[PDB]
Amino acid sequence: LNPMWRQGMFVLPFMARLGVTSSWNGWSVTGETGLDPGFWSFEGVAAAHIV
Amino acid sequence: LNPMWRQGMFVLPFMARLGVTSSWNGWSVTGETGLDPGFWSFEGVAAAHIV
Amino acid sequence: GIFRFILFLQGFHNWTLNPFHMMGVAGILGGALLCAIHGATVENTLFEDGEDSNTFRAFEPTQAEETYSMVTANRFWSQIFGIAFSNKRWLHFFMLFVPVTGLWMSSVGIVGLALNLRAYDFVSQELRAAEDPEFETFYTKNILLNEGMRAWMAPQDQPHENFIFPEEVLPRGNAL
Amino acid sequence: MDRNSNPNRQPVELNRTSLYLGLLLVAVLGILFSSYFFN
Amino acid sequence: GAFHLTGVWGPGMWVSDPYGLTGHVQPVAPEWGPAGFNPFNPGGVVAHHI
Amino acid sequence: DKSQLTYDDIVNTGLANVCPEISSFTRGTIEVEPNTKYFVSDFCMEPQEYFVKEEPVNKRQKAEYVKGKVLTRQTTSLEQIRGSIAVGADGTLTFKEKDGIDFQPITVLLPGGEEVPFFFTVKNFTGTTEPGFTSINSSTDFVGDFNVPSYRGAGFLDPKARGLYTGYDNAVALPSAADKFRTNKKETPLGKGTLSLQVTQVDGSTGEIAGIFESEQPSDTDLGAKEPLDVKVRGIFYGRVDT
Amino acid sequence: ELNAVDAKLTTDFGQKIDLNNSDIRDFRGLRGFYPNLASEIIKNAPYDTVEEVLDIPGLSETQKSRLEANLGSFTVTEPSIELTSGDDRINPGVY
Amino acid sequence: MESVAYILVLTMALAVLFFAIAFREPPRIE
Amino acid sequence: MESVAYILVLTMALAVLFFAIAFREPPRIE
Amino acid sequence: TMWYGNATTPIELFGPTRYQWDKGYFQEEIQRRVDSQLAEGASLSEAWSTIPEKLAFYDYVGNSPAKGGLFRTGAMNSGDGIAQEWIGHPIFKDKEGRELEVRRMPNFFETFPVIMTDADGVVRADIPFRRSESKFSVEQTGVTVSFYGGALDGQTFSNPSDVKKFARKAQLGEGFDFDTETFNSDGVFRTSPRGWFTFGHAV
Amino acid sequence: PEKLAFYDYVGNSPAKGGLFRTGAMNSGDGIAQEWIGHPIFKDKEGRELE
Amino acid sequence: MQVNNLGFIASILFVLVPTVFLLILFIQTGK
Amino acid sequence: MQVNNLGFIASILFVLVPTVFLLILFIQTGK
Ligand code: CLA
Ligand code: CLA
Ligand code: CLA
Ligand code: CLA
Ligand code: CLA
Ligand SMILES: CCCCCCCCCCCCCCCC(=O)OC[C@H](COP(=O)(O)OC[C@@H](O)CO)OC(=O)CCCCCCCCCCCCCCC
Ligand SMILES: CCCCCCCCCCCCCCCC(=O)OC[C@H](COP(=O)(O)OC[C@@H](O)CO)OC(=O)CCCCCCCCCCCCCCC
Ligand SMILES: CCCCCCCCCCCCCCCC(=O)OC[C@H](COP(=O)(O)OC[C@@H](O)CO)OC(=O)CCCCCCCCCCCCCCC
Ligand SMILES: CCCCCCCCCCCCO[C@@H]1O[C@H](CO)[C@@H](O[C@H]2O[C@H](CO)[C@@H](O)[C@H](O)[C@H]2O)[C@H](O)[C@H]1O
Ligand SMILES: [Ca+2]
Ligand SMILES: [Fe+2]
């Protein structure tokens, strides 16, 4: 009942569309928990674009 | 219990000190009502400084 | 049908309130103003280049010099309006620029209206009006006009929807 | 009366080093006072 | 001092009781004695300006 | 002070909001029977002074009245009112208001910018005197009660088109929060006012009474939105008691 | 919370014609009522029960017979001031 | 949202530092 | 407090109008 | 492709499309699942309590991207609020036992009259504007509402104020409880990232 | 008087503010509505406490 | 956090007004 | 009035940023 599209998330669906669904903090946009995305979480992708 | 100095009024005490206590709207800073200040109310003094 | 589309966009979208349409209106009325003012200024700053009262025959297309006095026109509008054109090329580029920019701005607004992205409401004034029944502006009156138009027009304007609005649900003021 | 040109007009300069120093001063003043502006 | 503060032609100045309950603008007469140098005496301000 | 004035003489002068006066002093009485009824032909009421009771932020400081200036123009008078005066078996005098132009909406401006609309009225006014009265004289004083209906009718529409028997029952401009507002429900209750008509000038040859009035009533609530303020109206009145 | 006439429409005021609150236009479905007999009914309001509408003075035999012929169309509720103030029973702003 | 303001003002100072080092007026002997 | 913003933007337009009339670049015949 | 929907614009990422609200796509699927459980032999509460809350949340006009405003800025949670729970499916019945359906608000309408029609498309109840000649009000027609599934499962509301409130909720599709205090939600609908993307890219 | 008691309140002293505690004094404690009256504190042995 | 409502506008203006003054003066230098 | 909390900063920046750009360009003109 509170997914990304209710929260104004603009770039997060575009990361999720191509395969980046999980965060370093531990949550995923599919509702699953405890996954290990490696570096290519949302934060890792954001850091890679900043660098 | 809500005089000018509780409301942050900076220039209103200086108008009141020299003789301008009433407004065109009808109130006075001494709590009196229904007085006729003429032109030299708070609004008239403010308008005279703008002009 | 175009008049219907126009009134439909008023009642359903509040298209007058949209700033993109206001820029369109400003551009179109400014283009009309510039057309009228430019033509009147040229016709009333013409050089005496012929002996007839009919001034139209005092021009030939292959001539080199200006048919009207830009200096006199500039002095006139500087003393009448405060400012005046001093550049012919800038004047005519501005006559181009104003209605074209108005059309582009109104088009951006219509693109917004395509997705029902309206400038329909000022939410501060509705929140106040819902809380305070003493608060009335011309904006809230226009909102009420839009509601009335929508309810009275939609069963006929959208017959595929089969909108049955019984007479008791139609918003209406006193006695009308 | 006539509108005469004033001969006391003089150009203002600010060099690049002065620009950098002023920009750094303004940035660090913002850094210092923003927490107090927010309170 | 002589017209505005005294109320001869003017409103006067704000005075009050020592506890600030009855403050109002009144004409104030100048105090020419040493009590004109009392900073809480408005007649001192009137004499000063005159 | 009109008597023989044509409507053309009176129009746009403001005298039509002025109640007629007694021609001279003529300080007399109207002799009344023990137990009969008389008709009051054209009862008039010209309000002159207006006061609204202050609601201070304290709940123990004395409330006090503050004078108001009238934002409406000379539309503040009741006139052409028919009514009756009944004399009691003890001797009491009962003035009863039947009909006429017996209401005016009046907005008064208070210092501080508060505009107070109210329904100045003498509707269904029943007033009595002290017992032991045999003549309508300068000591005659009808004190009693009148009905103050709601200032806005129950067909009135607020700026969001909410009213009582017409209009929305919710804030339609906010569709997910449409029923969260207490001003969605309107109400037009009947309030009560107290009126004292003190007769000060009587004319015996014509049956003309005149005098002063003080009335106290609530103000507009805007269909129940706000609490009503107390409005005291002082003025003068005139009437013709049919003998 | 419902307002007053919504609470009335919950009651028998919404099913048939109330002798204390209903407008004059509601009497048009009763033959021979509008405008005279309905005006007399509205003028002689309020009524404690339905039957004292047959006790109105000035009723001729025809008016009594037409009121007895359609007594089953009427109810009485408490007279509500929201529908009565300013003669809304004659003209409520509906045409 | 104050965090955005703090990040912006710190970033402005660090950008000023970069542009003052990388794009200084060169000291020239003349 | 939005009234201050509206007053400022209207005042900016009116000040621009004054400075464009009073202090225009003068049109010179040359 | 953002506005009409695509494999590359899934509704879990950008929100549902306006055309899903227009043709009753999620409502049709919800009704199909409920009819399947009714054909299996289950009760109405049982059939409605196995509708997922996500599927009901799709069937809500406040999640349509064609309900926003150009200057209604930000998240959709700044509008109606954060969705907490599905209140369950209402069934409105008049006093004569006919099942009534609230006509839903189309995407065009900022406001919409509350209309209740029966199975054969005849209006049996409404919320009238003028009550002086009202015939089909909730008060006269005796409309009650019973909720199946969700938070209000097994409950029946017959007080006409509650019934009118639930009628206005059902006008917006599947009703939801909202937390409106977290973001100080002002009550006017926003558009989704699907709508904002379409607007920016079209312009 | 309530005004005299309002003077006798440390939140009306000008030496209780902050440099970045901006604005009116009503933004601090609030708008004063009413005086609650003077307390007398007494312990269990009847001594008056201040 | 419950910050001053004017803190953001005060911080941005406190930074940006003299920044603008310095940029105006630097860019016009050499005229 | 219950306005957007960002309305003041958006209005001031919307006015002031291109104002600054225009003033920068005008003052340096002639260099
Ligand atoms: C290898 C480097 C790399 C990688 C792995 C990524 C990865 C990502 N980026 Mg990033 N990005 C990069 C470099 C990279 N980026 C660079 C250099 C820039 C600056 C231009 C950006 C700017 C950027 C933005 C603004 C965004 C991303 C976003 C994203 C995320 C989703 C991308 C998406 O939606 O696809 C979309 C891509 C396309 C639809 C490709 C369009 C190509 C067209 C169709 C071809 C045009 C025709 C062609 C020339 C001729 C025909 C060819 C044919 C004949 C073969 C994803 C994690 C998004 C995000 O999630 O933010 C964090 C987002 O908003 N990136
Ligand atoms: C005739 C014109 C006139 C009048 C009647 C007023 C009247 C007023 N002004 Mg205004 N003002 C004016 C012109 C005027 N002003 C001009 C031209 C300016 C721009 C400089 C201002 C700027 C201004 C400001 C900023 C303020 C006022 C304020 C006020 C109000 C209170 C003034 C006060 O506190 O006194 C104070 C005055 C003094 C203490 C005088 C100081 C003179 C010193 C002591 C003399 C210096 C020594 C001397 C040169 C040498 C010794 C002399 C000796 C030997 C004789 C009052 C209604 C206040 C207000 O209420 O805002 C609305 C306020 O804040 N005015
Ligand atoms: C009989 C007529 C008469 C009367 C009744 C007065 C009455 C008064 N005069 Mg006036 N005066 C008069 C005639 C009169 N004067 C004449 C003929 C002149 C010559 C033109 C003056 C020149 C004069 C001056 C210059 C001053 C007065 C002041 C005063 C007031 C003193 C009360 C006060 O606030 O002190 C306060 C002021 C002081 C105690 C003087 C300041 C002394 C300090 C210590 C020196 C400052 C030095 C340094 C910069 C600061 C060091 C501090 C450090 C920690 C930073 C008082 C109402 C004072 C005033 O304006 O009141 C507000 C004042 O400053 N008078
Ligand atoms: C096209 C790209 C794009 C799209 C589709 C979005 C979409 C979205 N953004 Mg986003 N954003 C973007 C670019 C984009 N953004 C960029 C470039 C930035 C950096 C500044 C941001 C920074 C940002 C933040 C901080 C936030 C968002 C948020 C959001 C969401 C809410 C929408 C909203 O309130 O805006 C409202 C849109 C308008 C009011 C329309 C503005 C149109 C202007 C005023 C017209 C200008 C007229 C012009 C000057 C006249 C021409 C003159 C003529 C003569 C030429 C939404 C899904 C919010 C969110 O929900 O976060 C999760 C959020 O807080 N965005
Ligand atoms: C000295 C003159 C003066 C004084 C005593 C006051 C006093 C007052 N004002 Mg006021 N005001 C003034 C001038 C003044 N004002 C001017 C010039 C303006 C126009 C901008 C205003 C506009 C104004 C408004 C809109 C309001 C007030 C309000 C108030 C009241 C609340 C105080 C407050 O919150 O401020 C807080 C003070 C600070 C946070 C201190 C700021 C100090 C700065 C940041 C230091 C700068 C450091 C510097 C850059 C570093 C140097 C670098 C170095 C290398 C050189 C107070 C009684 C408020 C009120 O209550 O209204 C009724 C109100 O809302 N004022
Ligand atoms: C006889 C028609 C006159 C009607 C008046 C309308 C024409 C004038 C409008 C111009 C206004 C702008 C003023 C500055 C413009 C300006 O300064 O004009 C200058 C222009 C130059 O004229 P001259 O000086 O050479 O000659 C005009 C006189 O001086 C002596 O002939 O004047 C004309 O052309 C007048 C010709 C009008 C005669 C025919 C026009 C017919 C148009 C109307 C037809 C009906 C239209 C509606 C049908 C749907
Ligand atoms: C009777 C006393 C004066 C009457 C009061 C008139 C006040 C307004 C006068 C116009 C001010 C000029 C500012 C334009 C800036 C200016 O001074 O430009 C002066 C400009 C002269 O252009 P040039 O031919 O010299 O251009 C050559 C090159 O410099 C091109 O860049 O005239 C125009 O461009 C006219 C076209 C735009 C006309 C714009 C006027 C819009 C009407 C007013 C809108 C009001 C909006 C604010 C309302 C709150
Ligand atoms: C109501 C609106 C009010 C508008 C306010 C406008 C604000 C104006 C502010 C003026 C800008 C001031 C800066 C000028 C900067 C500047 O012009 O360059 C330095 C400048 C050198 O000037 P010159 O004498 O060489 O002149 C050559 C010209 O090109 C400069 O005009 O010397 C000073 O101005 C002394 C004051 C600042 C001394 C340096 C301070 C910064 C060094 C430290 C940086 C921070 C590090 C902190 C670490 C803890
Ligand atoms: C410079 C030329 C002269 C300028 C014009 C003359 C002065 C008039 C403006 C003075 C400034 C504001 O002055 C004052 O504003 C407040 C705030 O709305 C008004 O106040 C009014 O609205 C507020 C709320 O909106 C309510 O309390 C009330 O309805 C009323 O008092 C006052 O009636 C006016 O006296
Ligand atoms: Ca009826
Ligand atoms: Fe031309």
Report residue C155: phi and psi, to 5°. Answer: -60, -35
What is the C69 CA–ligand 7 centroid distance (Å)? 20
Amino acid at F64: E
Q: Kind and range of the H or E element at F127?
A: strand F126-128
Q: Is A35 in the pocket of ligand 4 (CB under 6 A)?
A: no
What tokens does J34 get?
């409920």
Report residue J125: phi and psi, to 5°. Answer: -150, 160
Q: Which chains have 3 or more CB–CB distances shorter than 8 Å to chain L?
A: D, H, M
Q: Which chains have 3 or more CB–CB distances shorter than 8 Å to chain D?
A: H, K, L
Q: Residues H4-13, buried b or exposed e (16+ Cβ, 10 A)?
A: ebeebbeebb
Chain L residue with minimum CA distance to M28: L28
Q: Which residues does a 6 A CB cutoff place in the pocket of ligand 8? A: D 13-15, 18, 21-22, 24-25, 28; L 17-18, 21-22
| CB contact at 8 A, F195 and F145 | yes
Q: How many Cβ atoms from other residues are within 10 Å of residue J69's Cβ?
A: 21
Q: Which residues contact residue B48 at a Cβ distance below 8 angstroms, ignoring those fewer than 6 apart?
A: none
Report the gap between the CA of C35 and the closest CA in chain I (Å). Answer: 23
Contact: K25, B2; criterion CB under 8 Å = no
| CB contact at 8 A, K7 and E22 | no
Total residues found in chain E within this entry = 50
Q: Identify all chain C residues contacting J191, using CB atoms and an 8 Å cutoff.
A: 115-117
Q: Which residues does a 6 A CB cutoff place in the pocket of ligand 1? A: A 11, 14-15, 18, 20, 45-46, 49
Between the two ends of chain M, the Cα-to-Cα distance in Å is: 48
Total residues found in chain M within this entry = 31
Query: How far is C-alpha A36 from the chain's CA centre?
Result: 12
Q: How many Cβ atoms from other residues are within 10 Å of residue M9's Cβ?
A: 16
Please give the angle made by the CA atoms of G47, G53 and G59, to the nearest 5 degrees.
140
Q: Which of C93, C78, C73 is nearest to C31 (CA)?
A: C93
Experimental technique: cryo-EM
3-state class of I4 per DSSP? helix
Strand-pair partners of E29 = none
J187 burial (CB, 10 Å; 0-12 / 13-18 / 19+) is buried
What is the L19 CA–ligand 8 centroid distance (Å)? 11
Q: Which of G26, G16, G9, G5 is nearest to G73 (CA)?
A: G16
* Parent domain of J101: 18-190
What tokens does F189 get?
């209750």
3-state class of F45 per DSSP? strand
Q: Which of L8, L9, L28 sits opposite M28 (nearest CB)?
A: L28
A41 burial (CB, 10 Å; 0-12 / 13-18 / 19+) is buried
Instruction: Pick the ligand that lies closest to the CA of residue J190.
Output: 4
Strand-pair partners of F146 = F193
B14 burial (CB, 10 Å; 0-12 / 13-18 / 19+) is exposed
The DSSP line for M1-31 is ----TTHHHHHHHHHHHHHHHHHHHHHTTT-
What tokens does F109 get?
């401006």
Report residue F235: phi and psi, to 5°. Answer: -170, -160
Tell me the helices (H) and strands (E) count for chain K, helix number first: 1, 2
Q: Identify all chain L residues contacting D18, using CB atoms and an 8 Å cutoff.
A: 26
Three-state SS letters, chain J: CCCCCECCECHHHHCCCHHHHHCCHHHHHHHHHHHHHHHHCCCHHHHHCCCCHHHHHHCEHHHCHHHCECCCCCCHHHCCCEEEEECCEEEEECCCCCEEEECCCCCCCCCCCCEEECCCCCEEEECCCECCCCCCEHHHHCCEEEEECCCCCCEEECCHHHHHHHHHHHHCECCEEEECCCCCCCCCCCCCHHHHHHHHHHC
Query: How far is C-alpha B22 from the chain's CA centre?
Result: 5
Paired sense of beta strands F115-121 and F37-53, if any: unpaired
Q: Which residues contact residue J47 at a Cβ distance below 8 angstroms, ignoring those fewer than 6 apart?
A: J33, J34, J37, J38, J148
Q: How many Cβ atoms from other residues are within 10 Å of residue E27's Cβ?
A: 16
Q: Kind and range of the H or E element at C7?
A: helix C2-13
Q: Which residues contact residue F185 at a Cβ distance below 8 angstroms, ignoring those fewer than 6 apart?
A: F169, F224, G1, G2, G3
CA-CA distance, G38 to G58, in Å (whole number)?
Answer: 13
Binding-site residues of C for chlorophyll a: 21
Amino acid at H3: S
Please give the angle made by the CA atoms of J86, J91 and J96, to the nearest 5 degrees.
160
Q: Which residues contact residue F137 at a Cβ distance below 8 angstroms, ignoring those fewer than 6 apart?
A: F29, F199, F202
CA-CA distance, F142 to F129, in Å (whole number)?
Answer: 5
CA-CA distance, F26 to C97, in Å (whole number)?
Answer: 85
Q: Is E39 in the pocket of ligand 3 (CB under 6 A)?
A: yes
Please state the atom number of ligand 7 nearest to the C-alpha of residue C80: 1
Between the two ends of chain D, the Cα-to-Cα distance in Å is: 56
Question: Phi-psi bin for G73: left (phi > 0), alpha (psi -120 to 50), beta?
Answer: alpha
What tokens does F172 get?
């339609």
Q: Which residues contact residue E27 at a Cβ distance below 8 angstroms, ignoring those fewer than 6 apart?
A: E5, E6, E7, E8, E10, E11, E12
Interface of G with J in 3-32 (CB under 8 A): 5-7, 9-10, 14-15, 23, 25
Residue nearest to atom 23 of ligand 9 (CA): F113
Interface of K with D in 7-36 (CB under 8 A): 19-22
Which residue spans within F138-229 are E strands per DSSP?
A: 141-148, 191-203, 208-218
Instruction: Measure Cα distances from D31 to D25, H7, L16 in Å.
Output: 10, 9, 12
Amino acid at J1: T
Instruction: Measure Cα distances from A36 to A4, A42, J12, J173 in Å.
Output: 20, 12, 22, 38
Please give the angle made by the CA atoms of G26, G30 and G33, to the nearest 5 degrees.
85
Report the gap between the CA of K12 and the closest CA in chain F (Å). Answer: 19
Q: Which residues contact residue F129 at a Cβ distance below 8 angstroms, ignoring those fewer than 6 apart?
A: F92, F93, F94, F140, F141, F142, F143
CA-CA distance, B34 to B38, in Å (whole number)?
Answer: 12
| CB contact at 8 A, F154 and F222 | no
Contact: A7, J57; criterion CB under 8 Å = no
CA-CA distance, C139 to B51, in Å (whole number)?
Answer: 33
Paired sense of beta strands J115-117 and J123-126, if any: antiparallel
Q: Which residues contact residue A20 at a Cβ distance below 8 angstroms, ignoring those fewer than 6 apart?
A: A37, A40, A41, A42, A45
| CB contact at 8 A, F121 and F149 | yes
CA-CA distance, C67 to C58, in Å (whole number)?
Answer: 8
What tokens does F52 get?
């609204």
Q: Is C144 in the pocket of ligand 6 (CB under 6 A)?
A: no
CA-CA distance, J28 to A4, in Å (whole number)?
Answer: 25
Q: Which residues contact residue J171 at a Cβ distance below 8 angstroms, ignoring those fewer than 6 apart?
A: J102, J103, J104, J105, J112, J114
Contact: M6, J73; criterion CB under 8 Å = yes
What tokens does F20 get?
């007629």
Question: Which residue matches tokens 């600054």?
Answer: M20
Total residues found in chain C within this entry = 176
Please give the angle made by the CA atoms of J8, J13 and J15, to the nearest 5 degrees.
105
CA-CA distance, E26 to B4, in Å (whole number)?
Answer: 19
Instruction: Measure Cα distances from J9 to C113, J88, J146 in Å.
Output: 22, 29, 37
CA-CA distance, E17 to M30, in Å (whole number)?
Answer: 67
Q: Identify all chain D residues contacting K19, using CB atoms and an 8 Å cutoff.
A: 36
3-state class of F242 per DSSP? strand
| CB contact at 8 A, F33 and F243 | no
What tokens does F212 get?
């002063």
Report the gap between the CA of C87 and the closest CA in chain I (Å). Answer: 9
Between the two ends of chain G, the Cα-to-Cα distance in Å is: 29
What tokens does F198 get?
């003190």
CA-CA distance, F95 to F122, in Å (whole number)?
Answer: 11
Amino acid at C99: P
Report the gap between the CA of L4 and the closest CA in chain M (Å). Answer: 12
What tokens does G19 get?
């002798």
Question: Which residue matches tokens 């929201």?
Answer: G82
Alpha carbons within 13 angstroms on the beta-carbon side of residue I3 total 2
Chain B residue with minimum CA distance to F66: B33
Q: Which residues does a 6 A CB cutoff place in the pocket of ligand 9? A: B 25, 43, 47, 50; F 112-113
Cis, peptide link before residue G35, omega less than 30° from 0: yes
3-state class of G81 per DSSP? coil
Query: How far is C-alpha G19 from the chain's CA centre?
Result: 3
Strand-pair partners of F97 = F83
Q: Which residues contact residue E26 at a Cβ distance below 8 angstroms, ignoring those fewer than 6 apart?
A: E7, E12, E13, E15
Q: Which residues contact residue F50 at a Cβ distance below 8 angstroms, ignoring those fewer than 6 apart?
A: F67, F68, F69, F70, F106, F108, F231, F232, F233, F234
CA-CA distance, J124 to J167, in Å (whole number)?
Answer: 13
Using a CB–CB cutoff of 8 Å, tell me whether D28 touches chain H: yes
K and E touch per CB criterion (3+ pairs under 8 A): yes
**What does DSSP assign to residue F167?**
B
CA-CA distance, F51 to F72, in Å (whole number)?
Answer: 15
Q: Which residues contact residue I6 at a Cβ distance below 8 angstroms, ignoring those fewer than 6 apart?
A: none
| CB contact at 8 A, F78 and F44 | yes
**What does DSSP assign to residue I26?**
P
What tokens does J84 get?
């907490």
Long-range pairs of D29-32 with CB within 8 A, sequence gap ≥ 24: D29/L14, D29/L15, D30/H9, D30/H12, D30/L11, D30/L14, D30/L15, D31/H6, D31/H9, D31/H10, D31/H13
CA-CA distance, B5 to B12, in Å (whole number)?
Answer: 9
Q: How many Cβ atoms from other residues are within 10 Å of residue G61's Cβ?
A: 7
CA-CA distance, F50 to F68, in Å (whole number)?
Answer: 5
Please give the angle made by the CA atoms of I17, I18 and I21, to the nearest 5 degrees.
85
The DSSP line for B1-51 is ---GGGTT-SSHHHHHHTT--B-SSSBBTTS-BS---TT-SHHHHHHHHH-
CA-CA distance, J122 to G81, in Å (whole number)?
Answer: 35
**What does DSSP assign to residue F66?**
E
Q: Kind and range of the H or E element at C157?
A: helix C138-157
Residue nearest to atom 28 of ligand 3 (CA): E48
Please state the atom number of ligand 5 nearest to the C-alpha of residue B10: 57
Interface of F with C in 160-189 (CB under 8 A): 160-162, 166-168, 171-174, 181, 183
3-state class of I1 per DSSP? coil
Using a CB–CB cutoff of 8 Å, tell me whether G93 touches chain C: yes
Q: Which residues contact residue M17 at a Cβ distance below 8 angstroms, ignoring those fewer than 6 apart?
A: none
Contact: K31, B5; criterion CB under 8 Å = no
Strand-pair partners of C118 = J69
CA-CA distance, K10 to F221, in Å (whole number)?
Answer: 40
CA-CA distance, C125 to F216, in Å (whole number)?
Answer: 35
Contact: M4, J186; criterion CB under 8 Å = no
Paired sense of beta strands F37-53 and F78-87, if any: antiparallel
What is the K22 CA–ligand 5 centroid distance (Å)? 8
What is the F38 CA–ligand 7 centroid distance (Å)? 78
What tokens does L5 get?
């409502």
Q: Resolution in angstroms, to 1 decimal, for this deposition?
A: 2.1
The structural domains of chain G, with segments of one domain joined by +, span 1-85
Among C33, C42, C43, C47, which residue has the most ligand 6 atoms within 8 Å of its CB, making it the best to mutate? C43
F233 burial (CB, 10 Å; 0-12 / 13-18 / 19+) is buried
